[PDB]
Ligand binder design. Structure first.
Ligand SMILES: Cc1cc2nc3c(=O)[nH]c(=O)nc-3n(C[C@H](O)[C@H](O)[C@H](O)COP(=O)(O)OP(=O)(O)OC[C@H]3O[C@@H](n4cnc5c(N)ncnc54)[C@H](O)[C@@H]3O)c2cc1C
Length: 370
């Protein structure tokens, strides 16, 4: 009589879905294809919307402890400060990916979510079957495709898909803060350091806590030095000399990767008893820092709609209808910002830009008015 859910993917979306369902009394199994549970991407920003999901997951305290809210979100163009934004009190937070992942994993385990590593979903059936790489077929009342941008769950079913790949990427790293070595300045701030001259090179500077700094080093794919990993120390120091102590530490990271990314928009997110959440459904440009925030809101919202006393099929349809427009709008605006390099101007976290962030999934209203 206990409802059964199978979740494919052990990322932020899958873990969120698993915790939220388990909290509602579902028997939940989560499948992670990797040998271990781990989050990549170095660091991550969350906002009010994602912090509220964490609150609703009972995972907020572990996240806030050991993460950071900068005094301000500052933007530079060619080393000149062009804006400082604090979003009228809107809560936000920076942390390492592992920090967020660990909080979600610990909460999942505390609740008795069944987690299988080395377990890869290769197909899903709308009537409620999930097939693993081994050949094993699992039956369930709900199947969640939270398996990222190349979702086999999605592709095993076939969803009409708008796909785009970014030509340019970036290198994301965690390094020591080296705060004392940085000297005079406001080194607790987020600082988005844009340049187009003498070359296109940008650093998003993002403190995660008193010990760890998240750096995003962005240069065109066509730049053989700026895009190099391990980093070409000289060309980063040249344009960002005030960050030399941290860049010296970054140069030690021989695991650095130049990551490109893609965006995804689907004609829908559901088929029968199958729901797609996270990047598998709606991967977006990083400009508004809402990829995971939207993913978490969506996975959390899915659990909510499954409490209405409907069939799973109808609840899934109602879920997309209810919650998707917030993601569609955020994805679109983020895409525009990215295409137009809008963030380079500063002062671009407008009310419309902050729309996803303002959404409270717990009370289902918009908060922190701008
Ligand atoms: C450069 C960059 C910066 C970003 N910055 C932010 C930010 O600051 N704030 C924010 O909110 N978002 C940010 N995002 C977006 C955010 O990273 C993603 O939206 C988020 O990680 C999506 O999580 P997910 O669980 O949907 O997918 P993923 O994180 O891709 O996780 C899926 C998990 O899938 C497991 N898996 C894959 N295939 C299978 C399978 N077949 N079977 C079982 N398991 C499988 C994967 O191995 C992994 O464990 C950023 C994105 C990029 C590219």
């Amino acid at each position: 009589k206990t409802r059964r859910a199978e979740v494919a993917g052990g990322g932020f979306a899958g873990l969120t879905a698993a915790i939220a369902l388990k909290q509602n009394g579902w028997d939940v199994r989560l499948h992670e294809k990797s040998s271990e549970l781990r989050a990549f991407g170095a660091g991550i920003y969350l906002w009010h919307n994602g912090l509220r999901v964490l609150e609703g997951l009972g995972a907020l305290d572990d996240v806030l402890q050991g993460s950071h809210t900068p005094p301000t979100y500052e933007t530079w163009m060619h080393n000149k400060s062009v804006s400082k934004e604090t979003f009228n009190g809107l809560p936000w937070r920076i942390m390492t990916r592992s920090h967020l992942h660990d909080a979600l994993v610990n909460r999942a385990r505390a609740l008795g979510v069944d987690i299988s590593v080395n377990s890869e979903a290769v197909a899903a059936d709308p009537v409620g079957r999930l097939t693993l790489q081994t050949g094993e077929v699992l039956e369930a009342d709900l199947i969640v495709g939270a398996d990222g941008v190349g979702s086999k769950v999605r592709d095993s079913i076939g969803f009409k898909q708008d796909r785009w790949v970014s030509k340019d990427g970036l290198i994301r790293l965690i390094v020591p803060r080296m705060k004392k070595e940085l000297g005079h300045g406001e080194w607790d701030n987020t600082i988005d350091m844009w340049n187009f001259w003498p070359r296109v090179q940008r650093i998003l500077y993002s403190p995660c806590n008193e010990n760890e700094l998240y750096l995003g080093l962005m240069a065109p794919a066509a730049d053989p030095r700026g895009s190099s990993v391990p980093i070409d120390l000289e060309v980063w120091v040249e344009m960002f000399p005030f960050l030399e102590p941290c860049l010296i530490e970054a140069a030690k990271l021989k695991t650095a990767r130049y990551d490109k990314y893609e965006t995804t928009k689907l004609d829908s997110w559901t088929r029968g008893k199958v729901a797609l959440v996270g990047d598998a459904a709606h991967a977006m440009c990083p400009a508004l820092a809402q990829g995971a925030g939207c993913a978490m809101v969506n996975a959390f919202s899915l659990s909510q709609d499954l409490e209405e006393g409907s069939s799973v099929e109808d609840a899934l349809v109602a879920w997309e209808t209810r919650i998707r427009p917030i993601t569609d709008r955020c994805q679109a605006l983020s895409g525009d910002y990215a295409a137009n390099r809008s963030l380079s101007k500063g002062n671009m976290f407008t009310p419309a830009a902050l729309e996803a962030a303002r959404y409270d999934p717990l009370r289902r209203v918009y908060s922190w008015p701008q």
